[PDB]
Amino acid sequence: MFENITTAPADPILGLADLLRADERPGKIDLGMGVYNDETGKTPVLTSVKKAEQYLLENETTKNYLGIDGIPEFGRCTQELLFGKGSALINDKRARTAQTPGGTGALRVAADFLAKNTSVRRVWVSNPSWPNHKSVFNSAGLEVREYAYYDAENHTLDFDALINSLNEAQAGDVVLFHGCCHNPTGIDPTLEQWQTLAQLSVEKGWLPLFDFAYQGFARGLEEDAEGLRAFAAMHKELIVASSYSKNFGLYNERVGTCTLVAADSETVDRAFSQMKAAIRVNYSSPPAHGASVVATILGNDALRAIWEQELTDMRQRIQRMRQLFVNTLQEKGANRDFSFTIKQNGMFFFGGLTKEQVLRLREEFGVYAVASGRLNVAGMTPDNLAPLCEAIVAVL
Amino acid sequence: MFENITTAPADPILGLADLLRADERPGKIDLGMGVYNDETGKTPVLTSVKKAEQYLLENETTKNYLGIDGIPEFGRCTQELLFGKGSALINDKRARTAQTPGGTGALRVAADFLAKNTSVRRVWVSNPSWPNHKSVFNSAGLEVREYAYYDAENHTLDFDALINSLNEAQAGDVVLFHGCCHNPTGIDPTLEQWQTLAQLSVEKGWLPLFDFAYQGFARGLEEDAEGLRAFAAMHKELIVASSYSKNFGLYNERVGTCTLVAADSETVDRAFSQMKAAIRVNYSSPPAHGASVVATILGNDALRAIWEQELTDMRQRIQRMRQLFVNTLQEKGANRDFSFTIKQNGMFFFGGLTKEQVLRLREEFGVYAVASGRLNVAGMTPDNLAPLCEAIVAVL
Ligand SMILES: *Cc1c(COP(=O)(O)O)cnc(C)c1O
Ligand SMILES: *Cc1c(COP(=O)(O)O)cnc(C)c1O
Ligand SMILES: O=C(O)CCCC(=O)O
Ligand SMILES: O=C(O)CCCC(=O)O
Numbered sequence A, B: 001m002f003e004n005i006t007t008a009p010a011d012p013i014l015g016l017a018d019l020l021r022a023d024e025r026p027g028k029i030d031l032g033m034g035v036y037n038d039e040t041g042k043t044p045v046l047t048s049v050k051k052a053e054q055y056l057l058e059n060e061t062t063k064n065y066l067g068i069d070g071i072p073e074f075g076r077c078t079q080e081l082l083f084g085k086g087s088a089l090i091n092d093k094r095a096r097t098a099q100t101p102g103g104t105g106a107l108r109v110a111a112d113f114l115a116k117n118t119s120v121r122r123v124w125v126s127n128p129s130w131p132n133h134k135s136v137f138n139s140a141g142l143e144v145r146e147y148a149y150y151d152a153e154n155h156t157l158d159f160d161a162l163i164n165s166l167n168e169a170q171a172g173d174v175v176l177f178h179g180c181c182h183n184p185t186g187i188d189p190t191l192e193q194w195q196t197l198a199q200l201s202v203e204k205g206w207l208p209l210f211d212f213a214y215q216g217f218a219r220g221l222e223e224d225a226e227g228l229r230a231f232a233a234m235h236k237e238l239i240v241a242s243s244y245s246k247n248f249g250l251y252n253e254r255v256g257t258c259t260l261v262a263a264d265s266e267t268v269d270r271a272f273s274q275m276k277a278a279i280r281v282n283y284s285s286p287p288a289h290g291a292s293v294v295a296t297i298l299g300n301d302a303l304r305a306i307w308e309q310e311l312t313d314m315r316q317r318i319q320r321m322r323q324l325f326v327n328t329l330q331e332k333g334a335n336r337d338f339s340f341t342i343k344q345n346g347m348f349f350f351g352g353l354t355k356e357q358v359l360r361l362r363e364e365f366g367v368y369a370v371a372s373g374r375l376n377v378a379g380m381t382p383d384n385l386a387p388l389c390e391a392i393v394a395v396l
Helices: A015-022 A047-059 A072-083 A102-117 A132-139 A159-166 A191-204 A221-232 A265-280 A288-299 A301-331 A339-343 A355-365 A382-393 B015-022 B047-059 B072-083 B102-117 B132-139 B159-166 B191-204 B221-232 B265-280 B288-299 B301-331 B339-343 B355-365 B382-393
Strands: A095-101 A122-127 A143-148 A174-178 A207-212 A238-243 A255-261 B095-101 B122-127 B143-148 B174-178 B207-212 B238-243 B255-261
Touching: A047 A288, A047 A301, A047 B047, A072 A095, A072 A221, A072 A238, A072 A255, A072 A288, A095 A102, A095 A265, A102 A132, A102 A207, A102 A238, A102 A255, A102 A265, A122 A132, A132 A143, A132 B265, A143 A159, A159 A191, A191 A221, A207 A221, A221 A238, A255 A265, A255 A288, A265 B132, A288 A301, A288 B288, A301 A339, A301 A382, A355 A382, B047 B288, B047 B301, B072 B095, B072 B221, B072 B238, B072 B255, B072 B288, B095 B102, B095 B265, B102 B132, B102 B207, B102 B238, B102 B255, B102 B265, B122 B132, B132 B143, B143 B159, B159 B191, B191 B221, B207 B221, B221 B238, B255 B265, B255 B288, B288 B301, B301 B339, B301 B382, B355 B382
Parallel strands: A122 A143, A122 A174, A174 A207, A207 A238, B122 B143, B122 B174, B174 B207, B207 B238
Antiparallel strands: A095 A255, A238 A255, B095 B255, B238 B255
């Protein structure tokens, strides 16, 4: 069977981990995968998470199966983060959430759901976007098209090109939108633009699909949900996949959700039964630990208070880091002006380097970034900032 | 989109959980899902697991991503449980294991792997078998055929019918075998029969796929692996999916593995890269907690000692329970002779009731079992044994 099998090409993001382990040069700077690092260059487990785990340890009595859609309390809590306390969606019982294995698992289930229960044939992904998007939808059997988004020249959102290219999207097509902190550009639509996209969407007949992986990293929990919420108030149906890997620092515990929204409760229930069937045929039920931790935190006011301050701290460290990055670059006499970095939201720096420049960075300096020229700013520490900038200047 | 969607039919096993929550009659007896229960009718978290969790709590420093195939130490440990300490497979580096979300996740990944990287078009499943098998393979796009196995009349393995029906399996076909504790019959092949199937398999050109969900529940860890091992010594390629939900009582933490075996290390590596690609497009990486617990236990001699005694205890409680079950049935003046129950391995009782009899059991008595007439013996306690047997006698 396996005699003619070809070696699959390494993942453009995850492949960096393998490369790094083989490179024994001490001063390696990892700016690849989008995980948070503290001032010491370590990705630690939040204090709020440790405390919740303590609670679980002491009060957990069984590890019996969770139910296809997972921990009920967890779904309720995620809905409020996304839609808001007194959301009409929540109150009209138009939403159903399923706990999934990370944000990727959520995208996979929505894709399987779509592929087999609707007439959806294609999904529109921004150009550029997280690489795994195309892969997830294509493996489900869906065709993936791309719409204009970034403006490499001005480093902004080319709204006109976005709209003009999306006019090719027919009714019944899925249009994938990043809730906030657009991976990898860091450029998000203004609230005004979100409303325009919302009205255009309903008018054209698109099925919105939001990918929320960084809620809380742009401006704050609620502020970051404005885009989705503008879409929620006008749409009958929509799908939203979120992750808790980044904002809770629970990467390996695989915590995320897939939410379905329909015109009413009976439609959403009928649809949700098919989503559960797609899950039963994948992993059966989701992993409890990570979601249990998230439910425990959000549900307890004290733990929630500590968690929110931790999220605020992380965001604040990244914002200060990108400013310090641009400042140090000028001191090293960097060729180009990278001030646009400060306008980007999230953990990434994008639009400054070329593929060959990043290749030379790892080759000659041991600095690891994604081939598209995307650097994890959250991986920059006061200690490595200097030798890193020196590496960049020598490559410009 | 979701206007014409049909309601998916409830799962034949998992659907019991929903039914039970709506039935408010106090004396409900749950004998559906195959989860272990102690003398009090509770499914607790093992002491060995609690201790490992304590260790994790104290010594875990990060929750950063695990790597597509998961915790390396965990894969190594699972290979020894399955193949044995000095296995040639391990030493010739012909095996590669991927940590997956439970045993179902493992079956799903192997299915996606098969469907897209090999010429496999069909899988042979025993009649009967766990219901989710067909579903998992069909959703992957593979055709599912069935081979004779059980003998309802004599309550044994109809070996002749098995072989005779499997002769319809062409070379390049996948043949799914349950490692031990056949779900739901509880009838497994004798070691002699395993060797016959092994020789027949190689001669016919079948691709073996073992489902290991109850290793340690029939006779013991090693004894239960004899069947697979007889197949391993003669086969170049094979796939094995295992679960740790039952033998470690880590149901909701979703712990399992998918192992690939090829003629040599280079072939297995080439093949394994495609399996990783299939995972990246599903859930990206697996949940660390459950597997971390399993790695911690198996790796530490003291914890392993406690765990093995816990497994021995569980098995011993089920063996005593089925004997007490048959004994109490005769005292209640049961119509039929159910002594064959004692010959079955695992947590289940199968072959005594009809669909209508199980319907009447939940309807009139609140006793819940699977519609196929399969009862979870591990759910029987000294307290419920009597009213349960009374319910059965009144239905015979
Ligand atoms: C991180 C990320 C994901 C994946 O979420 P997981 O929890 O790691 O599976 C999905 N989409 C985007 C845009 C991401 O940044
Ligand atoms: C329990 C079981 C599974 C599922 O394993 P999970 O860890 O629950 O996903 C698979 N196959 C058989 C035969 C089982 O009994
Ligand atoms: O790729 C992933 O699965 C996680 C890191 C996210 C990113 O770097 O875009
Ligand atoms: O069905 C499942 O997913 C778990 C219980 C196993 C069984 O009852 O066969």
